Design a protein around this ligand. Structure first.
Ligand SMILES: [Zn+2]
Ligand SMILES: [Zn+2]
Ligand SMILES: [Zn+2]
Ligand SMILES: [Zn+2]
Length: 217
């Protein structure tokens, strides 16, 4: 019923979603070329390789459902976003119930996880993977932001609290060679907003590197 529990995915997700190639090699006990074969077969939509001496950042094409009022059939995951970010009160309150599933390993999600080679991961491992992969988990992007070096139509009378970043870049589909909108998630103001939303700079760095990878398509 479940798919195969993937050694490489398992190890990366247990180690925070990124490891150096040298670390992974030590864990898997293979010659470098044998590991590269495994990584290349899964492809860049699952394992991002970069120079950091190289590292591997785990990702997935699995995404959380974006429908307002979903009914079957659906090919996406159904779960509580805020919960995976440690930001859902219902994880503490006994008053009423969250409308979103707080169990990523639900019957409903089972087949989707299998379709994406994610069987045999626990909720902590899945959350690590998803939060650095699905743009759904990012803070809102400012639609008033048109690009760098422009008098912004936002920010008055009160400061803008939305990210001044390219939304398409975060979704892996910015088609500009020289985009006018920032692709720099590691900017200090961005990191503050990410942090408040529940994303640490280390998580954002992984997101940055995954998005850089997709932009280089
Ligand atoms: Zn759905
Ligand atoms: Zn919830
Ligand atoms: Zn703004
Ligand atoms: Zn862009």
């Amino acid at each position: 019923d479940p798919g195969v529990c993937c050694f490489i995915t398992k190890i990366l997700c247990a180690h925070g979603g990124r490891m150096t190639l040298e670390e992974l090699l030590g864990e898997i006990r293979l010659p470098e070329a044998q590991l590269y074969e495994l990584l290349e077969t899964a492809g860049p939509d699952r394992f991002v390789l970069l120079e950091t001496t190289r590292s591997v950042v785990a990702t997935t094409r699995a995404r959380v459902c974006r429908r307002k009022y979903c009914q079957r059939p659906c090919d996406s995951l159904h779960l509580c976003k805020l919960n995976l970010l440690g930001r859902c009160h219902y994880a503490q309150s006994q008053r009423n119930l969250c409308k979103y599933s707080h169990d990523v390993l639900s019957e409903q999600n089972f087949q989707i996880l299998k379709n994406h080679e994610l069987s045999g991961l626990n909720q902590e491992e899945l959350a690590c993977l998803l939060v650095q992969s699905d743009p759904f988990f990012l803070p809102e992007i400012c639609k008033s932001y048109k690009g760098e070096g422009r008098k912004q139509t936002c920010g008055q009378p009160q400061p803008c609290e939305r990210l001044h970043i390219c939304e398409h870049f975060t979704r892996g589909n910015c088609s500009y060679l020289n985009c006018l909108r920032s692709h720099n998630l590691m900017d200090r103001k961005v990191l503050t907003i990410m942090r408040e939303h529940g994303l640490s700079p280390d998580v954002v760095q992984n997101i940055q590197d995954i998005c850089n990878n997709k932009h280089a398509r």
